[PDB]
Amino acid sequence: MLSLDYNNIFIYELLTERFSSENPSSIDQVVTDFDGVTFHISTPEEKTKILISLSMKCYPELVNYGTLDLLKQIYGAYVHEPEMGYNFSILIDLQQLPATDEEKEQLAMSISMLKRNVLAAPFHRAFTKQAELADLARKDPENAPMLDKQATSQELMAIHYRDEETIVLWPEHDRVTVVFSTKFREETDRIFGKVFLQEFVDARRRPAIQTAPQVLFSYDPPLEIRDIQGIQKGDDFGFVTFVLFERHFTPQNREDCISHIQVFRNTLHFHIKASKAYMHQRMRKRVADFQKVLNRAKPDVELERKTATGRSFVRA
Amino acid sequence: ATSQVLHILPKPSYEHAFNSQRTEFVTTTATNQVELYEQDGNGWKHARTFSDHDKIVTCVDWAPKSNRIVTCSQDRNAYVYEKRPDGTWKQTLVLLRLNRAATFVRWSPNEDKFAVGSGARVISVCYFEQENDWWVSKHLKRPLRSTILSLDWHPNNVLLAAGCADRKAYVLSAYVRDVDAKPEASVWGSRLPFNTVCAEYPSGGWVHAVGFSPSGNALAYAGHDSSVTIAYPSAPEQPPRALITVKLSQLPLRSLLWANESAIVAAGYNYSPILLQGNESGWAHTRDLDAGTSKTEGPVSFTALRSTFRNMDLKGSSQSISSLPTVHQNMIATLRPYAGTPGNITAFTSSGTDGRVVLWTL
């Protein structure tokens, strides 16, 4: 694979089975995910009823940035009391299930999409507030810089979404800026991570990909995040900034852009691993050419003619 | 000087001996077998294998007048082989009583006894008793401190030189009573009982090779430091008249042979025999016997088509891997008299780790 899926594959496949099934069996399944997230899927009252539940260490921050109204909008009737030990929970009934195979497909997708629907709330808060500031700035272009200056400090979101990261984002009348305060703690990933983060910034400075968000990088923080909690300049973090302009989150694009920006650091983490799998296949190619430099030291003798299994043979 | 390549053996050939008729030769392949080769018009043919050893054979020798072969191996045994009237060879185990491998063996000039060097810090001088039909071993052991790398006997039956890995060349009496006649009073001594020591000569590196002058009045020996030393003794308990060391510019010598009282051939890791000349005033390296010292289209065969593709595939490119300019392609392990009166070698032979057996005429 060249780029990560946005949804949890297991919940998609599992619900695609049970929504097709004529005869459901019971389940009890904890299921890990990226960024320290964890799902629990089980059938607690009946084989007929699936409870999907989510655990995520920063969910208390995400409830401040309006998460429950987004989840109640998406999951509606299926929302349930949080399972003990989990932050959020949804109860889907296989007999009360939607009618068509394309309703079943989009419900199995929507429920597997839970990690990026819970982590989307601060992005929708920023996109919908930039739509207000875009109208206020269009009412007075000389007031607009001061609306941006106050929204840069008053409307800023920060999510400590895993212990070696922070995502910080804020609206201004023409953009949403998002900064990843990103660190690789595993030292062989820190060494490759310098290459992967540097070549990521140097890629944006080429004619082919000018249509993308303006990425920027440093290792100290952008001036407008220098006093956020957990952001510290000395601790060998790197500060990848994306500036999403109004053209990067136009109504056709918003949902792909939210899905695609959250997965950023996870594609670099995956591609650092998948680059070791590349360097190895390129190393064992050079080893196989050093074989030729030693083979010229073996004196020429014909090894005797043998059958395919190595047993001796008597012809020619 | 001229080189003639007598045979190419399929495996390394640390040692060989030609019989007194020069009609057949024995040789030690780098396994527990010993090959016997015979003339085939101008060629040579494999006649028989001896195989009585348990482990790798280390050295072999063939008594001129009495026609018996003797063999050593890492199995710590020796065998003496003697011709039965029907044409085959009678093996006979010799109880060497060695705690570690046998390295190197020589028949004495009267062929009544033979000496075997060892890794066990000792040399087993073996002789035969018609009273018992045994071979019995006497251990020389007093001064020897490490593995024995080579032996040579004096032209009188008593004195034995040995090169040892403790960087020294020993001269020992191997007089065994009720085999030897009395030794003549001579430069090395006259009070001469078994294991009395006539010299403990120094070297810079391991002494690979030793050999007395044809007159017996000097010893030459050769170091892994790539020097040849010639020692001229005076009398017992007395310093030598000269201890001339000539240092070569080449890789080490492994074997050594007096051509006459004034000239020596030597050979080894340099892939080529060399000639040294001198006397008790001084010695110098004087010639290389190999012209390789100077470092000197048509239809195409199926085996040249197949090998030019197998070269492109297994190796870098089509082009052949070159020969060395010398006749031998690997270290020349042993160097042996072949023709001329004793003390005027006119031709000698050598056998290599590459498996070439070669005749050299001076």
Asked if B239 has any chain A CB less than 8 Å from its own CB, the reply is: no
CA A297 to chain centre: 53
Mutation for A interface: B8, B303, B307, B315, most A CBs within 10 A: B315
Looking at residue B292, the DSSP 8-state letter turns out to be G
**How far is it, in rounded angstroms, from Cα A237 to Cα A220?**
9
Question: Closest by alpha carbon to A155, among A181, A185, A177, A186?
Answer: A177
Strands B24-29 and B34-40: antiparallel
Helix axes A121-139, A144-154, angle to 10 degrees: 160
CB-CB neighbors (< 8 A) of A292 in chain B: 314-316
* Residue A89 near residue A56, CB atoms below 8 Å: no
CB pairs under 8 A between A and B: 11
**How far is it, in rounded angstroms, from Cα A155 to Cα A118?**
19
Token pair listed for A126: 């920023």
Q: What is the CATH number of the domain that holds B228?
A: 2.130.10.10
Instruction: Decide whether A1-129 matches A131-302 in CATH topology.
Output: yes
CA A25 to chain centre: 31
> In what side-by-side order are the strands of the sheet with B102-107?
B102-107, B113-118, B123-129, B134-140
Looking at residue B340, the DSSP 8-state letter turns out to be S
Resolution in Å equals: 3.2
CA of B18 vs chain A CAs: smallest distance (Å): 28
Asked if B330 has any chain A CB less than 8 Å from its own CB, the reply is: no
CB-CB neighbors (< 8 A) of B316 in chain A: 292-293, 296
**How far is it, in rounded angstroms, from Cα B243 to Cα B233?**
9
- For residue B310, give the 3-state DSSP assignment: helix
* Residue whose tokens read 């009890």: A28
Given 3.30.750.24, 3.30.1460.20, 3.90.1280.20, 3.40.50.12500, which CATH number is that of A131-302? Answer: 3.30.1460.20
Reported as type and span, the H/E element at residue B359 is strand B356-361
Asked if B306 has any chain A CB less than 8 Å from its own CB, the reply is: no
Helix axes A121-139, A67-75, angle to 10 degrees: 110
Residue type, A80: H
Rounded to the nearest 5°, which phi and psi values hold at B168? -140, 155
**How far is it, in rounded angstroms, from Cα B2 to Cα B349?**
11
Q: How far apart are the first and last CA of chain A?
A: 51
Distances (CA, A) of B75 to A205, B56, B122, B137: 75, 7, 16, 17
Rounded to the nearest 5°, which phi and psi values hold at A36? 75, 5
Q: Compute how many other C-beta atoms are within 10 angstroms of the C-beta atom of residue A84.
A: 7
- For residue B40, give the 3-state DSSP assignment: strand
CB-CB neighbors (< 8 A) of A293 in chain B: 316
Token pair listed for B345: 């070698």
Q: Compute how many other C-beta atoms are within 10 angstroms of the C-beta atom of residue A97.
A: 14
* Residue B126 near residue B136, CB atoms below 8 Å: yes
* Residue whose tokens read 């009496």: B173
**How far is it, in rounded angstroms, from Cα A243 to Cα A251?**
17
Residue type, B31: T
Domain residue spans of chain A = 1-129, 131-302
**How far is it, in rounded angstroms, from Cα A97 to Cα A114?**
18
Reported as type and span, the H/E element at residue B257 is strand B253-260
**How far is it, in rounded angstroms, from Cα B237 to Cα A214?**
97
Q: Which residues pair with B59 in a beta bridge?
A: B72
Question: For the CA atoms of chain A, what is the radius of gyration?
Answer: 26
**How far is it, in rounded angstroms, from Cα A26 to Cα A44?**
8
* Residue A10 near residue A40, CB atoms below 8 Å: no
Q: How far apart are the first and last CA of chain B?
A: 4
* Residue B122 near residue B144, CB atoms below 8 Å: yes
Question: Closest by alpha carbon to B256, among B269, B273, B240, B270?
Answer: B273
Distances (CA, A) of B134 to B128, B158, B196: 6, 21, 26
Domain count, chain B: 1
* Residue whose tokens read 């890990």: A32
Question: For the CA atoms of chain B, what is the radius of gyration?
Answer: 21
Length of chain A in terms of residues written: 316
What string of H, E and C letters represents the secondary structure of chain A? CCCCCCCCHHHHHHHHHHHHCCCCCCCEEEEECHHHCEEEEECCCCCCEEEEEEECCCHHHHHHCCHHHHHHHHHHHHEECCCCCCCEEEEEECCCCCCCHHHHHHHHHHHHCHHHHHCCHHHHHHHHHHHHHHHHHHHCCCCHHHHHHHHHHHCCEEECCCCCCCEEEEEECCEEEEEEEECCCCHHHHHHHHHHHHHHHHHCCCHHHCCCCEEECCCCCCHHHCCCCCCCCCCCCEEEEEEEEHHHCCCCCHHHHHHHHHCHHHHHHHHHHHHHHHHHHHHHHHHHHHHHHHHCCCCCCCCCCECCCCCECCCC
Q: Which residues pair with B71 in a beta bridge?
A: B60, B79
What string of H, E and C letters represents the secondary structure of B163-206? EECCCEEEEEECCCCCCCCCCCCECCECCCCCCCEEEEEECCCC
Cβ pair A292:B307 closer than 8 A: no
Q: Please give the CATH number for the structural domain made up of A1-129.
A: 3.30.1460.20
Question: Closest by alpha carbon to B330, among B358, B311, B288, B310?
Answer: B358
Question: Closest by alpha carbon to B352, among B292, B278, B283, B270?
Answer: B270
* Residue B120 near residue B100, CB atoms below 8 Å: yes
